[PDB]
Coordinates of C-alpha atoms in Angstrom, one line a residue:
Chain A
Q1 CA -18.3 -20.4 -28.0
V2 CA -15.3 -21.1 -25.8
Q3 CA -16.3 -20.6 -22.1
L4 CA -14.7 -21.5 -18.8
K5 CA -17.0 -21.3 -15.7
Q6 CA -15.7 -21.6 -12.2
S7 CA -17.2 -22.8 -8.9
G8 CA -18.2 -20.2 -6.4
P9 CA -16.2 -18.0 -4.0
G10 CA -15.9 -19.0 -0.3
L11 CA -13.9 -19.0 2.9
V12 CA -11.1 -21.4 3.6
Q13 CA -9.7 -21.8 7.2
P14 CA -5.9 -21.4 7.7
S15 CA -4.0 -24.7 7.2
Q16 CA -7.1 -26.2 5.4
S17 CA -7.3 -26.9 1.6
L18 CA -8.7 -25.1 -1.4
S19 CA -10.8 -26.7 -4.1
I20 CA -12.1 -25.1 -7.3
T21 CA -13.9 -26.6 -10.4
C22 CA -13.5 -25.2 -13.9
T23 CA -16.2 -26.4 -16.2
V24 CA -15.4 -25.7 -19.8
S25 CA -17.4 -25.7 -23.1
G26 CA -16.8 -24.8 -26.7
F27 CA -13.7 -27.0 -26.7
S28 CA -12.4 -30.4 -25.5
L29 CA -10.0 -31.0 -22.6
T30 CA -8.4 -33.7 -24.8
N31 CA -7.2 -30.9 -27.2
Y32 CA -6.2 -28.0 -24.9
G33 CA -4.3 -27.5 -21.7
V34 CA -6.0 -25.6 -18.9
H35 CA -3.9 -23.2 -16.8
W36 CA -4.5 -21.7 -13.4
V37 CA -3.5 -18.1 -12.5
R38 CA -4.2 -16.2 -9.3
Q39 CA -4.3 -12.4 -8.6
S40 CA -3.4 -11.1 -5.1
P41 CA -2.8 -7.7 -3.5
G42 CA 0.8 -8.7 -2.6
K43 CA 2.0 -10.4 -5.8
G44 CA -0.6 -9.5 -8.4
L45 CA -0.8 -11.9 -11.4
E46 CA 0.9 -15.2 -10.7
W47 CA 0.9 -18.3 -12.8
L48 CA 0.3 -21.4 -10.7
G49 CA 0.3 -24.4 -13.0
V50 CA -1.3 -26.2 -15.9
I51 CA -2.9 -29.6 -16.8
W52 CA -2.2 -30.6 -20.4
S53 CA -4.3 -32.4 -23.0
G54 CA -2.8 -35.7 -22.2
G55 CA -3.0 -35.4 -18.4
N56 CA 0.5 -34.2 -17.5
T57 CA 0.9 -31.4 -15.0
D58 CA 3.4 -28.6 -14.4
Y59 CA 3.4 -26.6 -11.2
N60 CA 5.1 -23.3 -10.6
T61 CA 8.1 -23.8 -8.3
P62 CA 6.7 -22.4 -5.0
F63 CA 3.5 -24.4 -5.3
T64 CA 4.9 -27.8 -6.4
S65 CA 4.5 -29.3 -2.9
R66 CA 0.9 -28.1 -2.2
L67 CA -0.8 -28.0 -5.6
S68 CA -2.6 -30.7 -7.6
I69 CA -4.5 -30.4 -10.8
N70 CA -6.8 -33.2 -12.1
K71 CA -9.5 -33.4 -14.7
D72 CA -12.5 -35.3 -16.1
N73 CA -12.4 -35.1 -19.9
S74 CA -15.9 -36.6 -20.4
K75 CA -17.3 -34.1 -17.9
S76 CA -15.2 -31.2 -19.3
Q77 CA -14.1 -30.4 -15.7
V78 CA -10.7 -29.4 -14.3
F79 CA -10.1 -29.8 -10.6
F80 CA -7.8 -27.4 -8.8
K81 CA -6.7 -28.1 -5.3
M82 CA -4.2 -26.4 -3.0
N83 CA -3.2 -27.4 0.5
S84 CA -2.3 -25.6 3.8
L85 CA -3.3 -22.1 2.9
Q86 CA -2.1 -19.1 4.8
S87 CA -3.8 -15.7 4.9
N88 CA -1.8 -14.4 1.9
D89 CA -3.2 -17.1 -0.3
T90 CA -6.3 -14.9 -0.3
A91 CA -6.7 -14.0 -4.0
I92 CA -8.8 -14.3 -7.1
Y93 CA -8.2 -17.6 -8.7
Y94 CA -8.7 -18.1 -12.5
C95 CA -8.7 -21.0 -14.9
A96 CA -7.5 -20.1 -18.3
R97 CA -7.0 -21.5 -21.8
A98 CA -4.4 -20.4 -24.3
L99 CA -4.9 -19.7 -28.0
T100 CA -3.1 -22.8 -29.1
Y101 CA -2.7 -26.2 -27.3
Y102 CA 0.9 -25.7 -26.3
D103 CA 1.1 -22.0 -25.7
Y104 CA 0.6 -19.6 -22.9
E105 CA -1.2 -16.6 -24.4
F106 CA -4.4 -16.6 -22.4
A107 CA -7.2 -15.7 -24.7
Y108 CA -9.9 -17.2 -22.5
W109 CA -10.4 -16.8 -18.8
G110 CA -12.8 -18.1 -16.2
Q111 CA -14.8 -15.5 -14.3
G112 CA -12.5 -15.9 -11.4
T113 CA -13.1 -17.2 -7.9
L114 CA -12.4 -15.0 -4.9
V115 CA -10.9 -17.1 -2.1
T116 CA -10.5 -15.7 1.4
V117 CA -8.3 -17.4 3.9
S118 CA -9.4 -16.5 7.4
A119 CA -10.2 -18.1 10.7
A120 CA -13.5 -16.3 10.8
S121 CA -17.0 -17.6 10.1
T122 CA -19.2 -17.0 7.1
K123 CA -22.1 -14.6 7.6
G124 CA -24.9 -13.5 5.3
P125 CA -25.8 -9.8 5.0
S126 CA -28.8 -7.9 6.1
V127 CA -30.4 -5.8 3.3
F128 CA -32.0 -2.5 4.1
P129 CA -33.8 -0.1 1.8
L130 CA -32.3 3.3 1.0
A131 CA -35.7 4.9 0.2
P132 CA -36.3 7.6 -2.4
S133 CA -37.7 10.9 -1.0
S134 CA -37.8 14.6 -1.6
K135 CA -34.3 14.7 0.0
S136 CA -33.1 12.3 -2.6
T137 CA -34.9 13.9 -5.6
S138 CA -33.8 16.8 -7.7
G139 CA -34.7 17.9 -11.3
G140 CA -37.1 15.1 -11.7
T141 CA -34.5 12.5 -10.8
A142 CA -34.8 10.3 -7.7
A143 CA -31.9 8.3 -6.1
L144 CA -32.7 5.1 -4.3
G145 CA -30.7 2.1 -3.2
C146 CA -30.0 -0.9 -0.9
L147 CA -27.7 -1.1 2.1
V148 CA -26.0 -4.5 2.2
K149 CA -24.6 -4.8 5.7
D150 CA -22.5 -7.1 7.9
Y151 CA -21.4 -10.0 5.7
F152 CA -18.3 -12.1 5.4
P153 CA -16.4 -12.8 3.4
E154 CA -16.4 -10.9 0.1
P155 CA -17.9 -11.0 -2.5
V156 CA -21.6 -10.0 -2.8
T157 CA -23.3 -9.6 -6.2
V158 CA -26.0 -6.9 -6.6
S159 CA -28.3 -6.3 -9.6
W160 CA -31.5 -4.4 -10.0
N161 CA -34.8 -5.6 -11.3
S162 CA -33.2 -9.0 -12.1
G163 CA -30.7 -7.5 -14.5
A164 CA -33.2 -5.4 -16.5
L165 CA -32.0 -2.2 -14.7
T166 CA -28.3 -1.3 -15.3
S167 CA -28.3 2.3 -16.4
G168 CA -27.4 4.7 -13.6
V169 CA -26.6 1.9 -11.2
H170 CA -23.7 2.4 -8.8
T171 CA -22.6 -0.5 -6.6
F172 CA -19.9 0.8 -4.3
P173 CA -16.8 -1.3 -3.3
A174 CA -17.4 -2.8 0.2
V175 CA -15.8 -1.4 3.2
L176 CA -14.5 -3.5 6.1
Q177 CA -16.0 -2.4 9.4
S178 CA -14.3 -2.7 12.8
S179 CA -16.4 -5.8 13.5
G180 CA -14.5 -7.5 10.7
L181 CA -17.7 -7.7 8.6
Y182 CA -18.1 -6.0 5.3
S183 CA -20.8 -3.6 4.2
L184 CA -21.8 -1.9 0.9
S185 CA -24.5 0.1 -0.7
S186 CA -25.8 0.0 -4.2
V187 CA -27.7 3.0 -5.6
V188 CA -29.5 3.9 -8.8
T189 CA -31.0 7.1 -10.2
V190 CA -34.4 6.9 -11.9
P191 CA -37.0 9.4 -13.1
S192 CA -39.1 10.4 -10.1
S193 CA -42.3 10.0 -12.1
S194 CA -41.5 6.3 -12.4
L195 CA -41.7 5.7 -8.7
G196 CA -45.4 5.2 -8.6
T197 CA -45.5 2.8 -11.6
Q198 CA -42.3 0.8 -11.8
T199 CA -41.1 -1.6 -9.0
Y200 CA -37.5 -1.4 -7.9
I201 CA -35.9 -4.5 -6.4
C202 CA -32.2 -4.9 -5.6
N203 CA -31.2 -8.5 -6.1
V204 CA -28.6 -9.5 -3.5
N205 CA -26.6 -12.8 -3.7
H206 CA -24.0 -13.6 -1.1
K207 CA -22.7 -17.0 -2.5
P208 CA -20.4 -17.9 0.5
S209 CA -23.4 -18.1 2.8
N210 CA -25.9 -19.2 0.2
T211 CA -27.9 -16.0 1.0
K212 CA -30.2 -14.5 -1.7
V213 CA -32.5 -11.6 -1.0
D214 CA -34.7 -9.6 -3.3
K215 CA -35.3 -6.3 -1.6
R216 CA -38.1 -4.0 -2.8
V217 CA -37.4 -0.4 -2.3
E218 CA -40.2 2.2 -2.1
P219 CA -40.7 5.8 -1.1
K220 CA -41.4 5.9 2.6
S221 CA -44.9 6.6 4.0
Chain B
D1 CA 12.4 -15.8 -12.9
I2 CA 12.1 -12.9 -15.3
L3 CA 11.1 -9.7 -13.6
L4 CA 8.9 -7.4 -15.6
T5 CA 8.8 -3.8 -14.6
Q6 CA 5.9 -1.7 -15.8
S7 CA 6.1 2.1 -15.9
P8 CA 4.7 4.4 -15.0
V9 CA 2.5 3.0 -12.2
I10 CA -0.3 5.4 -13.1
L11 CA -1.1 7.1 -16.4
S12 CA -3.6 10.0 -16.6
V13 CA -4.6 11.2 -20.1
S14 CA -7.4 13.1 -21.9
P15 CA -9.7 11.4 -24.5
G16 CA -8.4 11.2 -28.1
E17 CA -4.8 11.5 -26.9
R18 CA -2.2 8.8 -27.6
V19 CA -1.0 6.8 -24.7
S20 CA 1.7 4.2 -24.3
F21 CA 2.7 1.7 -21.6
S22 CA 6.2 0.4 -20.9
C23 CA 7.2 -3.1 -19.9
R24 CA 10.9 -3.6 -19.2
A25 CA 12.3 -7.1 -18.6
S26 CA 15.2 -8.2 -16.4
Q27 CA 16.9 -9.9 -19.3
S28 CA 16.3 -10.3 -23.1
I29 CA 13.2 -12.2 -24.0
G30 CA 12.9 -11.6 -27.8
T31 CA 9.4 -10.7 -28.6
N32 CA 7.8 -13.2 -26.2
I33 CA 5.5 -10.8 -24.5
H34 CA 1.7 -10.6 -24.3
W35 CA -0.5 -7.7 -23.1
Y36 CA -3.7 -7.8 -21.1
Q37 CA -6.5 -5.4 -20.2
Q38 CA -8.4 -5.6 -16.9
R39 CA -11.5 -3.6 -16.3
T40 CA -13.4 -3.1 -13.1
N41 CA -14.7 -6.5 -11.8
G42 CA -13.4 -8.2 -14.9
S43 CA -11.1 -11.0 -15.9
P44 CA -8.0 -10.2 -17.9
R45 CA -8.5 -9.7 -21.6
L46 CA -5.8 -10.6 -24.2
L47 CA -4.9 -7.5 -26.3
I48 CA -1.6 -8.3 -28.0
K49 CA 0.4 -11.6 -28.4
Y50 CA 4.1 -11.8 -29.1
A51 CA 4.8 -8.1 -28.7
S52 CA 3.0 -6.9 -31.9
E53 CA 0.6 -9.5 -33.1
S54 CA -3.1 -8.6 -33.3
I55 CA -5.9 -10.4 -31.5
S56 CA -9.4 -11.1 -32.9
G57 CA -12.0 -8.7 -31.6
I58 CA -9.5 -6.2 -30.2
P59 CA -10.1 -2.6 -31.5
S60 CA -7.5 -1.4 -34.0
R61 CA -6.4 1.5 -31.7
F62 CA -4.4 -1.0 -29.6
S63 CA -0.9 -1.9 -30.8
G64 CA 2.4 -3.2 -29.5
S65 CA 6.1 -3.0 -30.3
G66 CA 9.5 -3.7 -28.8
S67 CA 12.3 -6.3 -28.7
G68 CA 14.8 -7.6 -26.2
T69 CA 13.9 -6.0 -22.9
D70 CA 12.0 -2.8 -23.9
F71 CA 8.3 -3.3 -24.8
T72 CA 5.5 -0.8 -25.5
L73 CA 1.7 -1.1 -25.6
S74 CA 0.0 1.8 -27.4
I75 CA -3.4 3.2 -27.7
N76 CA -3.4 5.7 -30.6
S77 CA -6.6 7.5 -29.5
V78 CA -7.9 6.8 -26.0
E79 CA -11.6 6.4 -25.3
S80 CA -13.4 6.4 -22.0
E81 CA -14.0 2.7 -22.2
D82 CA -10.2 2.2 -22.0
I83 CA -10.3 3.0 -18.3
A84 CA -8.6 -0.1 -17.0
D85 CA -5.4 -1.7 -15.7
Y86 CA -2.9 -3.0 -18.2
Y87 CA -0.5 -6.0 -17.7
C88 CA 2.4 -7.5 -19.6
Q89 CA 3.4 -11.1 -19.6
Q90 CA 6.6 -12.8 -20.7
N91 CA 7.0 -16.4 -21.7
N92 CA 10.5 -16.7 -23.1
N93 CA 11.5 -18.2 -19.8
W94 CA 9.7 -20.7 -17.5
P95 CA 7.7 -19.9 -15.6
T96 CA 5.7 -17.3 -17.4
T97 CA 5.5 -14.1 -15.3
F98 CA 3.4 -10.9 -15.3
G99 CA 4.2 -7.3 -14.6
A100 CA 2.7 -5.4 -11.7
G101 CA 0.5 -3.4 -14.0
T102 CA -0.2 0.2 -15.1
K103 CA -3.4 1.9 -14.2
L104 CA -5.0 4.1 -16.9
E105 CA -7.0 7.1 -15.7
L106 CA -9.0 9.5 -17.8
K107 CA -9.3 13.2 -17.5
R108 CA -12.5 15.2 -18.2
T109 CA -14.1 18.5 -17.4
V110 CA -15.0 19.3 -13.8
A111 CA -18.4 17.9 -12.8
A112 CA -20.1 18.8 -9.5
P113 CA -21.6 16.0 -7.5
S114 CA -25.4 15.7 -7.1
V115 CA -25.9 15.1 -3.3
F116 CA -28.5 12.8 -1.7
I117 CA -29.0 11.8 1.9
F118 CA -30.8 8.7 3.3
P119 CA -32.2 8.3 6.8
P120 CA -31.9 4.9 8.4
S121 CA -34.8 2.6 7.6
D122 CA -37.2 1.5 10.3
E123 CA -36.1 -2.1 9.5
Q124 CA -32.5 -1.4 10.4
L125 CA -33.5 0.5 13.6
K126 CA -35.1 -2.7 14.8
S127 CA -31.7 -4.4 14.7
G128 CA -30.4 -1.8 17.1
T129 CA -28.2 0.2 14.6
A130 CA -28.6 3.3 12.5
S131 CA -26.8 3.9 9.2
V132 CA -27.1 7.3 7.5
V133 CA -26.0 7.4 3.9
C134 CA -24.8 10.5 2.0
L135 CA -24.5 10.0 -1.8
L136 CA -22.3 12.1 -4.1
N137 CA -23.2 11.1 -7.6
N138 CA -21.3 11.5 -10.9
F139 CA -18.5 14.0 -10.2
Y140 CA -15.0 14.8 -11.3
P141 CA -12.3 15.0 -10.1
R142 CA -12.3 12.3 -7.4
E143 CA -11.3 14.5 -4.5
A144 CA -14.3 15.6 -2.3
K145 CA -14.9 16.3 1.4
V146 CA -17.8 15.0 3.4
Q147 CA -18.5 16.5 6.8
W148 CA -21.2 15.0 9.1
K149 CA -23.0 17.1 11.8
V150 CA -25.5 15.8 14.3
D151 CA -27.3 18.7 16.2
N152 CA -24.3 20.9 15.2
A153 CA -21.8 18.4 16.6
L154 CA -19.1 17.6 14.2
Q155 CA -18.9 13.8 13.7
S156 CA -15.4 12.2 13.5
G157 CA -14.3 8.6 13.2
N158 CA -17.8 7.1 12.9
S159 CA -18.2 7.3 9.1
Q160 CA -16.8 5.4 6.2
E161 CA -16.4 6.4 2.6
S162 CA -16.5 4.3 -0.6
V163 CA -15.7 5.5 -4.1
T164 CA -16.5 3.7 -7.3
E165 CA -14.0 3.2 -10.0
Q166 CA -14.1 5.7 -12.9
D167 CA -17.2 5.3 -15.1
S168 CA -16.5 3.8 -18.5
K169 CA -18.8 6.1 -20.3
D170 CA -18.7 9.6 -18.7
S171 CA -15.4 9.2 -16.7
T172 CA -17.0 10.4 -13.4
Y173 CA -16.9 9.0 -9.9
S174 CA -19.6 8.5 -7.3
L175 CA -19.0 8.4 -3.5
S176 CA -20.9 7.2 -0.5
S177 CA -20.3 8.3 3.1
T178 CA -22.0 6.2 5.7
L179 CA -22.5 7.5 9.3
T180 CA -23.1 4.6 11.7
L181 CA -24.6 5.1 15.1
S182 CA -26.3 2.9 17.8
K183 CA -30.0 3.2 17.7
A184 CA -29.8 4.7 21.2
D185 CA -27.6 7.6 20.0
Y186 CA -29.7 8.1 16.9
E187 CA -32.8 8.5 18.9
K188 CA -31.2 11.0 21.3
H189 CA -30.6 13.4 18.4
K190 CA -32.7 15.4 15.9
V191 CA -30.8 17.1 13.0
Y192 CA -28.7 15.0 10.7
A193 CA -26.6 16.7 8.0
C194 CA -23.8 15.9 5.6
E195 CA -22.0 18.9 4.0
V196 CA -20.2 18.4 0.7
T197 CA -17.3 20.3 -0.6
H198 CA -16.0 19.8 -4.1
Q199 CA -14.1 21.8 -6.8
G200 CA -17.2 22.0 -9.0
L201 CA -19.3 23.7 -6.3
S202 CA -19.3 27.5 -5.8
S203 CA -20.3 26.8 -2.2
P204 CA -20.8 23.8 0.1
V205 CA -23.9 21.7 -0.4
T206 CA -25.7 20.6 2.7
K207 CA -28.3 17.8 2.7
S208 CA -30.1 17.1 5.9
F209 CA -33.2 15.7 7.7
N210 CA -34.8 15.8 11.1
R211 CA -35.4 12.3 12.6
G212 CA -39.1 11.7 12.2
Chain C
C1 CA -0.8 1.0 -4.8
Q2 CA -1.7 -2.6 -4.7
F3 CA -4.3 -4.8 -6.3
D4 CA -7.8 -4.6 -4.9
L5 CA -9.7 -7.9 -4.6
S6 CA -13.1 -6.1 -4.3
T7 CA -12.9 -4.1 -7.5
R8 CA -10.3 -6.2 -9.4
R9 CA -8.5 -2.9 -9.9
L10 CA -5.2 -1.3 -8.8
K11 CA -5.6 1.2 -6.0
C12 CA -4.4 4.8 -5.8

């Protein structure tokens, strides 16, 4: 199948440069162009440029001076690089492939890469259990969760039981605390009778700081 | 550059109803417009190419029309899984440009929240901070009030709320309210309570605990 | 309102 997979999210210091890799499969870079689009709060969807089958590049006008796109056909990799970022370059960056080799209807997208431009430092989260109790149990259903606190920058991925538990899961959007660090909770509702039999583990991955925690959550003593 | 203006900014409709999205261009662009869907935490998904041409894998309920400057994306019978943002894109004129998007919200019957409260863990208390979490699960509509009280003292300015996007299956929302205190403050008090007010409740729901 | 980087959704 046609797939585009991007390198991970991270923090870029103001004035420094941004680098992202798009590794593609299910097609050849010698036969298709690969485009780059970003999505920001201020400007929304914005086309940045493209590297064509034969190696030529076009860059959108405002980015022509600080953008370069290169590629490695044999490795099926496309390399995106942007210079001197300011805070408003904070955005989700995508690589994309059109339906035909010459066109611009983007049928295939990378998963996106959230890039944060900030002078701050990267910080992994602490993970605390939100334990099930009688005060979180009603009608045979217990709620439980994980508190993912004090990290920077976004994003954090959270799953439960290594992906096997998805039903009734709610991972809330992170809030920005006054410290400038983010915090979120992820909750799930399960049958209360399962609490003594099934294990519940929230899998937390904060890619920017290379922090991975599996937090087991149990009814408190 | 071509400016694409999408209207309205937000659409709110009931399931099974027909819905349509407008994209107006600053100058004529033939039928060189494509439509995309973006779901929560997702990458854009190509729905229609060249104003009206179908895309493999896209449900038949999606269709497009329009010529010149006035374009329309339609969903003949909306389903809950259609909760998303919708974007148009022109490519008659370099560089290709996108609209600012239209958000598609779904209506449903009133559903009261199930309320749960969580004391801070002993692990967090070690770090010197106490977070108390109140959970409002699976409710509609989105509007709700959460009031925190500690030993009958109304709390203000020391909590944060987060609301999920609409659920793609049942069209509900869930909400968290997190009360944050220093461990010192937390230990100086006994009764912790969040009171929830919502349209679907005949009276406020209070969940509480005593520290220890 | 604007686009939210956390949820990849438009606010308000």
